[model samples]
Target: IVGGYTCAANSIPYQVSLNSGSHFCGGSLINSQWVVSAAHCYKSRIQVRLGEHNIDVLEGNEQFINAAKIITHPNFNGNTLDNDIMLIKLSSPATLNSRVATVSLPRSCAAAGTECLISGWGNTKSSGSSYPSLLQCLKAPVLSDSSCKSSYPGQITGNMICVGFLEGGKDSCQGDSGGPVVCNGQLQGIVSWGYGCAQKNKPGVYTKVCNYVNWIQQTIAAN
Candidate 1:
């Protein structure tokens, strides 16, 4: 992400990279066998990488697992970007360790001004720029509902929450979609959309993860 720094090695244990042959999106390891990501990141065939630090380097701690199944929200609307969340069942359960682990789902919705951390291997520039090898991370605060609505009129919804600096500069960019927005050690949001990468008055929008806690549990239980 632009205006962010590289994450320390294995700092984000719950982070995972959603890939085909290369990284396309980011996700969080929610359980040994399940990952949470954005529904908009759907692809024909995807591989999930856990314990990943550098995308190009062969880190011995990494586990490349195929996606056994992907379940996107039934009401997900691509055009409007509503209900933009998904669950990926791993072919095999991940081996938890110091370098690999799961993040807990949020117990409650994140309120305005909540400082959260966002990390990913997404683009670091708003324009044309290559993806970073090391994961990028930044701390941003949640914007109030009123402020978010004003930033993107007629587009903000209860399912979506905005987070980042109102002055701009620090935010998740492309390829960061489906990544985690963690607050107080809980997976509170998933990077979904934005007006532009770290633009003034334009904060990154995320799926309000608290709203999908039930759907996630039910889906995991039924499947």
Candidate 2:
């Protein structure tokens, strides 16, 4: 995030690191065997890690799980980033503990101006530095569709949720994609993409979770 602090361990137990031989994106545990993230974050040799906060150090609670399957939204487009969401089916169910848990999905649309939290190990300075070993978090303000559109022009859509500063000093940067966007202790979106990290008037864009709740449920059920 643009301006943030080192996060407390186990505070966001649902969060996980998505890797394809190496760390590429972030994801959240929605259930014992399911992870939610952005479609564009997918890579070959996909894997996931749970119950760990500091990725640079091995923690006792850490569990590296193989991905059994991947279900990208039917309409997902890597080019335009539309329908930028996906589901990861874990090969085995996770053993929940004090340091590992699942997050709830939003039941309805989140109103504009709702305060939210985002956490990741993304590029800190935007100088193309490496991802952090410690997770970072920040509080951001939700923007209305009109406001988001005014900032991003034609990029903003109903399937997306916009949150950041108007002046653009806070945002989810590279490697932060597919991270959680939580509001009121519920998941409202997935960190998807942005024009640049903390660019002026270019707030971070997220895949609105509410828009694909049904699809998420359906995908898991069918599989």
Candidate 3:
């Protein structure tokens, strides 16, 4: 839930900015010290904007946090774009504001078919470009393990979960990967992959937060 209207700031917040001159995706504050994002977002340089809602850091009325280090999943594969998860350690802890707060990680696995909220500055339509100042959100139903397996086959591994509209038309897009999928005030998943943006018969995939709980904790501890 990284992108949305920030009444306080009156703009859209750009969570992650890549060095390639594109604002690639959003991220979630997993802890006071770490921001969780997609591994593929790890380019030469990436910056996380806080407090504001606009993609342009200079134009937004909020604070910004430059990443100090990026740690991608050990088994990340760029070819398949699977295992596309990572953590961004900010140079310093974000200054808490009404517009900025860390999302709580889920203690238990979210039940399958649970409806959740996903948000980002991703493209509004398939084959369209990413939004710059407006953050968008959509609801999706969590897919059951069996259903996901049937739909994704070898793609849905233990580390992943599936969520999206079965009828399509609404899903995470190219720039939305690594954003948060929240349910009941808990961060349940990280937007990972899908067939284009909201395609038919293709549900969006996520990195299961529950499965990575231990690893997340350990990584934070080490940091």
Candidate 4:
């Protein structure tokens, strides 16, 4: 994320690195064996790095687990970025501890202008390297739905939420897809996509988790 700062290793235990062979995206731990992220972040094969802080250095506490299943929302539409959320199942369950925890889902809609945050390993600039060793995080103020729609014209959907200052600067960059967008200790959204990174008037777009509560509940019920 651009204009972001490094967070403590154990601060957001639910954040995880979604490894796709050589590359990676971000994901959130919703439960011991289930991780939620954007559907588009998935690749042909995948694994997850849990309890991870600094990616460059090997930490003995980090849990590398193979993904058992990649479950994208059946209604997901890549063209319009609709229903972009997904659930990743781990072959082996994560062992909960101080360094590994799950985030709680929202039971209500996030009020407009609510303060929130996003984090990832995405590079900050156009010419910068792709991923960062340490996890980066920053505050992203929730934009009103109306303002978001205005910024995207006809692109913003009911399932999406926008965050960032109208003046721009801070945002989740290219490689930050599927990361967590948190507010008041709740998982409100998932970094889905945007028009561009931190551009003037163009803010980061995220999949509104409140709208998918039913889908998530049912998915977990059967799993």
Q: Where does candidate 4 stray beyond 4 Å?
A: 126-130
Question: Taking the tens digit of each residue's C-alpha lDDT, what string does model 4 give over 25-100?
Answer: 8999998999999998868578899888887778888998988988999999989999999898899999999999
Candidate 3 lDDT by residue in tens digits, 45-118: 77776654556556545556678888998988876666778988888887664566777888898998888878
lDDT for model 3, on a 0 to 1 scale?
0.72
Clashing residue pairs found in predicted model 2: none
Better of 1 and 2 by lDDT: 1
At residue 223, what lDDT does model 1 achieve? Answer: 84
Total residue pair clashes for candidate 4:
0
lDDT of 1 by residue, 54-105 (tens): 9999979999999999999999999889999999999999999999999999
Model 2 score (lDDT): 0.87
User: Any runs in candidate 3 off by more than 4 Å, and if so which?
Assistant: 1-20, 57-61, 79-82, 130-132
For each candidate, give its TM-score against the true structure: 0.98, 0.97, 0.87, 0.96
Residue 117, candidate 3: C-alpha displacement in angstroms? 0.8
List per-prediction Cα lDDT, in the order shown: 0.93, 0.87, 0.72, 0.87
**Over the stretch 1-223, how does candidate 2's per-residue lDDT look in tens digits?**
6677778987989999997766789999999999999999876458899987888788788999999998889999887798999899999998898788999998787889999999988888855565788889989978888878888788776788798887877888998999999999889989998888888888898998988889989998999
Off by over 4 Å in 2: none
Which candidate model has the greater TM-score, 1 or 4?
1
Per-candidate RMSD, Å: 0.8, 1.1, 3.3, 1.2
